[PDB]
Design a protein around this motif. Structure first.
Motif, PDB file in Angstrom:
ATOM      1  N   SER D  32      -7.083   6.772   4.129  1.00  0.00           N
ATOM      2  CA  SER D  32      -5.607   7.393   3.349  1.00  0.00           C
ATOM      3  C   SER D  32      -5.267   8.846   3.285  1.00  0.00           C
ATOM      4  O   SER D  32      -5.596   9.276   3.248  1.00  0.00           O
ATOM      5  N   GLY D  61      -1.233   4.704   1.456  1.00  0.00           N
ATOM      6  CA  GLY D  61      -1.189   3.312   3.463  1.00  0.00           C
ATOM      7  C   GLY D  61      -2.355   2.523   3.270  1.00  0.00           C
ATOM      8  O   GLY D  61      -2.938   1.714   4.416  1.00  0.00           O
ATOM      9  N   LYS D  62      -2.697   2.122   2.176  1.00  0.00           N
ATOM     10  CA  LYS D  62      -3.922   0.780   1.686  1.00  0.00           C
ATOM     11  C   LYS D  62      -3.961   0.744   0.742  1.00  0.00           C
ATOM     12  O   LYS D  62      -3.091   1.648  -0.038  1.00  0.00           O
ATOM     13  N   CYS D  91       3.600   8.143  -3.501  1.00  0.00           N
ATOM     14  CA  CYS D  91       3.797   7.795  -1.815  1.00  0.00           C
ATOM     15  C   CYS D  91       5.488   7.428  -1.350  1.00  0.00           C
ATOM     16  O   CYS D  91       4.916   7.384  -0.612  1.00  0.00           O
ATOM     17  N   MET D  92       5.832   7.612  -2.620  1.00  0.00           N
ATOM     18  CA  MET D  92       7.164   6.679  -1.813  1.00  0.00           C
ATOM     19  C   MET D  92       8.278   7.087  -0.446  1.00  0.00           C
ATOM     20  O   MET D  92       8.803   7.051   0.150  1.00  0.00           O
ATOM     21  N   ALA D  93       7.797   8.723  -0.005  1.00  0.00           N
ATOM     22  CA  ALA D  93       8.309   9.627   0.901  1.00  0.00           C
ATOM     23  C   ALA D  93       7.057   8.920   2.909  1.00  0.00           C
ATOM     24  O   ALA D  93       7.667   9.896   3.320  1.00  0.00           O
ATOM     25  N   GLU D  95       4.827   8.023   5.407  1.00  0.00           N
ATOM     26  CA  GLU D  95       5.300   6.793   6.181  1.00  0.00           C
ATOM     27  C   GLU D  95       4.854   5.140   5.829  1.00  0.00           C
ATOM     28  O   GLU D  95       5.275   4.437   6.316  1.00  0.00           O
ATOM     29  N   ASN D  96       3.703   5.096   5.485  1.00  0.00           N
ATOM     30  CA  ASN D  96       3.597   3.513   4.590  1.00  0.00           C
ATOM     31  C   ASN D  96       2.659   4.101   3.011  1.00  0.00           C
ATOM     32  O   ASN D  96       2.108   4.972   2.729  1.00  0.00           O
ATOM     33  N   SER D  97       4.033   3.246   1.874  1.00  0.00           N
ATOM     34  CA  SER D  97       4.447   3.533   0.911  1.00  0.00           C
ATOM     35  C   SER D  97       3.622   2.943  -0.211  1.00  0.00           C
ATOM     36  O   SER D  97       3.353   3.553  -0.973  1.00  0.00           O
ATOM     37  N   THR D  98       2.270   2.372   0.941  1.00  0.00           N
ATOM     38  CA  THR D  98       1.478   1.191  -0.156  1.00  0.00           C
ATOM     39  C   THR D  98       0.959   1.722  -1.030  1.00  0.00           C
ATOM     40  O   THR D  98       0.197   2.847  -0.806  1.00  0.00           O
ATOM     41  N   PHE D  99       0.383   2.154  -2.662  1.00  0.00           N
ATOM     42  CA  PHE D  99      -0.393   3.166  -3.762  1.00  0.00           C
ATOM     43  C   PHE D  99      -1.479   2.516  -3.380  1.00  0.00           C
ATOM     44  O   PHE D  99      -2.399   1.706  -3.284  1.00  0.00           O
TER      45      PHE D  99
END
Lengths: 360, 122, 361, 110
Positions: D32, D61-62, D91-93, D95-99
């Motif tokens: 992450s 990103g996970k 995480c909104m900015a 590369e992957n925004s998954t929290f």
């Protein structure tokens, strides 16, 4: 000043790690693997596996393999069935391998997603709903063979005494053996005689797997065996798990990944429950029975803690059991298992736990 | 013949895992998910394939053939989860087996809910 | 004998329906809207909304609008932020509208995803993390452009007395008003004087929204007002929700979508808890207080049932409250609300419930 | 003590503590990625009686860790004071925004 960093490796050695495959059936599009340290119950990390993921660790211990299904917009759009390769220490994604859109979607029985003993090929179950076995070449990152000879069969039992051989259980009650070439294509095959009566004494698919033989238990508590010390598999059985007292209380097996074998001793472990009848084959264990497969007699019985699935580590003499949410750790260095600890809340809906391989 | 016609029966009876026709069901009952025993909830699609079996009807004493279809293409309903296993068999008797997703050949295979469709006398 | 069919409509009529936005925070990639019948608690269906969905119903009651984020491989691959249009009666997907990859990802406050009074534009909050307001043209299925004038502001409060105007709350303690043209671009704008002190009396963003004014409550139990009956917004306050006894027990507001206005009576509904101090502004309701906004006096107080969010229906005189998992239905046709029923297990992690619109022209 | 929501540094955490998720207070769990942006909290140190700035970076990103969920709100403010606000995905900015989880990073005094 402190700085938050990424790029870190799992904090415990590989030999401490276990993998709890959480289906998260209530939210099955967000299934994942949870990585725990079995020695202290510490959560070490996780790997996301989208819709109904399956998992295994590479036999050399270096990589984690997952199998899953994506769609462009989850509930609509184009389907992609894949195997993914992940680094085992960094828990990072490395490679996607495309599969045809028929990988099995179902509960996490070990035999749906396996690998050859030499680790060079991933061997997986397809259902379209017609069944076949798919072969993935790990080095090439390619799906290389579709074993249509396995139509009407189910699940993959690797032969630990050969580099690229495995068996599957067929609708005739026998076993089909497939031997792959070094290219992952079928190099030869054979069919055993009938091992069990499909109608009268169906077996659970989970093998109690030895180096050169496998044992299977039946819905009625019988045991069948497949000996693959030779190229042709020799089959036998039944012998009964039950004595007369056991029969009077209607003891039968129940569970999912419900058996295991301790190879050094020949002890087989089986989840059992009383008051067996039609429809109880997936009941939680009232007891674990410990069977001597050489003498065909029970040696010990202990409380089952409502377990449904198990796995064995040969070299540390350990058995894990799993009730759907909690993982029990047992020492099986002696005939009576000893409970060491329970890891509570390891998953919301898991029917499969596996050790990190240490045997190479 | 109320025992054959779930829409005429008490909802609590039909939405129970003990209802006679739900004898080899694995999943969330569609009748608890905004559908009925024989209709998918809005915006979910019937599976064209299914596992099958027979169930005994204790109300009329007869045995019936059941087709256990899923509804598909929406995420998990979450309600009235059943896991009954009467005469259910492993994947080497594939169409008697209920540990697989019978949405597996749908346009979208996401599993939403499942039900028990009455085919006829066994 | 029987055949399983699809293609069916929701079994209860629209006027019975409510929408519970389940974030499913524990598994936030499988958020969804649960559709319930408020009259009997029956579950009617659902709409899947991927990662941290937001939801609203079209003003005309025909469509459900969702806003969500996809990636090609969920946790990796290209991001797609979208609005989706769903048929309300069939609960089926119709259309996807592409957004720039900066739609707000956050808890489900009403004001993050709204529409103009005339229903022609969807108006949503962006954060990149720079803030702007996004405008979607519903007829065209198109994103128009960012309202960059809204930098440093937050949330969308539609003005119900104008067809395509809304306000947002800014870091200077005032309100920015945006008036859109028929194409959805900014036609004009204005900025109020300071309404509240950001440092000394911060307000909750949730409005108690009337047709031509909005009230806001503060962390310390004050009330502020923005009147937009005229050309420009006039601001006032504070007045206190609290009497001496209230103050003595440190009662303050708390929750998320924590207020509501019953427009015909001017009654404002607010979640409150005692022993307020720094850090308690999202605490569950010990009580619901009912305030007369004309007399500026409390007219009722009832048990809060640990509620965090609410919504009001003007057409049936109802209030729903929501504690995260359970929805309480109240009759608010008299000053003291009456509890009608509770719908247990409506969601795993919801902070927003909404009625299906009836009337409202 | 660090895995408790009441640990002094966690005074404006909304999310799962990374230290319960295979990371630590200042390292993301394996696989992450830290957020480059964050909300910032001011927390009182109960030992020296001084106030410290804490930067609440998310790991991204996970999918959700699910362990040690906290929702503390000391000095937290709404989105019109955006970098004091914790009801958004920091995480909104990415590369992957998954929290995945939230860290509690000590910047220094104030």
């Amino acid at each position: 000043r402190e700085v938050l960093t990424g790029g870190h490796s799992v904090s415990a050695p590989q030999e401490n790690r276990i993998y709890v495959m959480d289906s998260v059936f209530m939210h099955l599009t967000e299934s994942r693997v949870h990585v725990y340290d079995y020695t202290n119950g510490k959560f070490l990390g996780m790997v996301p596996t989208a819709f109904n993921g399956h998992v295994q660790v590479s036999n050399d211990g270096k990589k984690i393999y997952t199998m899953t299904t994506y769609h462009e917009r989850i509930t609509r759009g184009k389907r992609s069935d894949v195997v993914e390769v992940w680094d085992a220490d960094k828990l990072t994604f490395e490679k996607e391998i495309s599969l045809p859109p028929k990988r099995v979607q179902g509960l996490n029985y070990d035999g749906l997603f396996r690998q050859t003993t030499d680790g060079k090929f991933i061997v997986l179950q397809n259902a379209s709903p017609a069944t076949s076995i798919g072969i993935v070449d790990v080095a090439k990152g390619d799906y290389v063979e579709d074993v249509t000879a396995a139509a009407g069969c189910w699940s993959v039992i690797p032969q630990p005494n050969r580099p690229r051989s495995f068996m599957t259980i067929c609708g005739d009650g026998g076993l089909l053996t497939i031997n792959l070439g070094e290219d992952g294509k079928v190099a030869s095959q054979s069919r055993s005689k009938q091992m069990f009566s499909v109608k009268d004494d169906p077996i659970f698919i989970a093998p109690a797997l030895d180096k050169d033989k496998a044992h299977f238990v039946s819905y009625y508590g019988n045991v069948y065996s497949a000996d693959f010390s030779g190229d042709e598999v020799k089959v036998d059985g039944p012998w009964s798990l039950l004595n007369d007292e056991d029969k009077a209380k209607n003891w039968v097996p129940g569970g999912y990944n419900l058996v295991g074998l301790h190879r050094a001793s020949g002890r087989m472990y089986v989840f059992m429950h009383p008051d067996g009848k039609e429809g109880t084959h997936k009941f939680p264990a009232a007891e674990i029975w410990v069977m001597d497969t050489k003498t065909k007699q029970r040696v010990a019985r202990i409380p089952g803690r409502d377990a449904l699935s198990m796995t064995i580590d040969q070299q540390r003499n350990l058995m894990l059991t799993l009730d759907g949410g909690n993982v029990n750790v047992y020492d099986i260095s002696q005939p009576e298992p000893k409970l060491l600890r329970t890891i509570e809340g390891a998953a919301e809906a898991s029917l499969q736990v596996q050790f990190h391989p240490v045997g190479g | 013949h109320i025992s054959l016609n779930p829409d005429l029966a008490n909802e609590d009876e039909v939405n129970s895992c003990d209802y006679w026709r739900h004898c080899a069901v694995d999943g969330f009952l569609c009748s608890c998910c905004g559908g009925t025993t024989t209709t998918c909830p809005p915006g979910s699609t019937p599976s064209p394939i299914s596992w099958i079996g027979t169930c005994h009807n204790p109300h009329d004493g007869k045995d019936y053939l059941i087709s256990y279809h899923d509804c598909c293409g929406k995420t998990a309903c979450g309600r009235c989860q059943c896991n009954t296993q009467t005469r259910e068999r492993p994947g080497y008797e594939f169409f008697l087996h209920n540990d697989v997703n019978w949405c597996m050949a749908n346009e979208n295979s996401t599993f939403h809910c499942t039900t028990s469709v009455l085919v006829g006398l066994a």
